[PDB]
Amino acid sequence: NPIIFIIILLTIMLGTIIVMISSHWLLVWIGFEMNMLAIIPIMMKNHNPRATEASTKYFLTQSTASMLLMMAVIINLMFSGQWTVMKLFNPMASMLMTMALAMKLGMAPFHFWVPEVTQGIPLSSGLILLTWQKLAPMSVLYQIFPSINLNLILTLSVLSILIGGWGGLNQTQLRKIMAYSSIAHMGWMTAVLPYNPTMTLLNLIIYIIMTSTMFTMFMANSTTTTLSLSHTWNKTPIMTVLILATLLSMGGLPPLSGFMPKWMIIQEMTKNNSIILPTFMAITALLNLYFYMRLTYSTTLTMFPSTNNMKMKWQFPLMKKMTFLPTMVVLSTMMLPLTPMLSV
């Protein structure tokens, strides 16, 4: 059990390297095939009958989303027979390409892949491992990029934040509130991808950091929003101040560094005489903030710590790489004149 838990966990990131290290559509088929093979055990570990009825709702959604990709390869096998990863030489192939791959990253259509899995997996511990599967197909859309129809990639992305926004105001379960606003932060980056496909990766590296540091804060006890009340005056009041800082940073407010992407990403979206496109989305992520305010109105205002239970003992979990996350996820807005010249 302990050693074989690494070898399963090691090959997840070995599956996604072959996706990136490839000049050949057959190897990118194998690449995130075996990821869909080596995630299914991590779903299981404590064997609860929601988890078995959740990974099977996870499974076949990423079997078909696999299967249409191999259909898209064999079409432009017939046309000119080159198999390098490049433009796909056929509009009937690229159309079938992009909205096949839109299930693994799930966009606004291909909807309930995101809440129905992440809710109620008893492994809420992590499930930070759902950042690799947002990272493998983005490494495929960097090459396919100069062959798309420019309407479909925006219509999946204009719907992305308009429906990833509305979906979670009606929630309490903070795994769903993390599952929502994970379609929204896939809406900002693929709205930009036809226009200068770098300054997309800037949004992604920020998104890995701010989301990974959100789950590590959650690993004391936290399950529900009512449980997010009862740890200010019990566990540590410094935790309440920290959990305020990242949310207000992840909303995009200019004293913090989640405003670092947008500020730069509109420098590219206009400069291309497209103005009505960002003004819709920039005003759309505003009610993506009413998750976070009304979440911060729970923990930071002493809202009813009742049912007197004392934690007179210390805490010994492993908060690994936590001391350096809200020091590059908040304070970096002055210190990045060019992060987009390292990553470029």
Binding site: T236, I238, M239, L242, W314, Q315, M319, M322, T323, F324, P326, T327, M328, L331, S332, M334, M335, P337, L338, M341, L342, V344
Partner: protein, 113 residues
């Protein structure tokens, strides 16, 4: 833009290098100076002047890495302008010479309130 898959290529020798006592390198690690104080504050230390050996090596980390990171940032702008000026130098038909005309040529609006 050639010589692919390097962290920073060979041709970055003639760049200054970005020597120290620049305020970014003071600031890089100042946040690490703030970060080590947080590292005590999470765990009910209850010191806020705790073990210095944990409070050191954060300063050493960011400053070394941030220096070794900035050598390609100044490279990438240096390779940016280097390719623009060449395409400015060729094709003069895309870059005309504008005429110098003083304020004896323009009759502007004229809109007073």
């Amino acid at each position: 833009g050639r010589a692919t898959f390097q962290f920073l290529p060979d041709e970055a020798r003639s760049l200054p290098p970005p020597k120290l006592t620049d305020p970014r390198l003071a600031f890089v690690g100042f946040l690490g100076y703030c970060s080590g104080l947080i590292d005590n504050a999470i765990r009910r230390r209850p010191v806020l002047l705790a073990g210095l050996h944990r409070q050191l090596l954060y300063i050493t980390s960011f400053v070394f890495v941030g220096y070794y990171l900035l050598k390609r940032q100044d490279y990438m702008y240096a390779v940016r302008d280097h390719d623009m000026f060449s395409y400015i130098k060729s094709h003069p038909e895309d870059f005309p010479e504008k005429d110098k005309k003083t304020y004896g040529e323009v009759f502007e609006e004229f809109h007073p309130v």
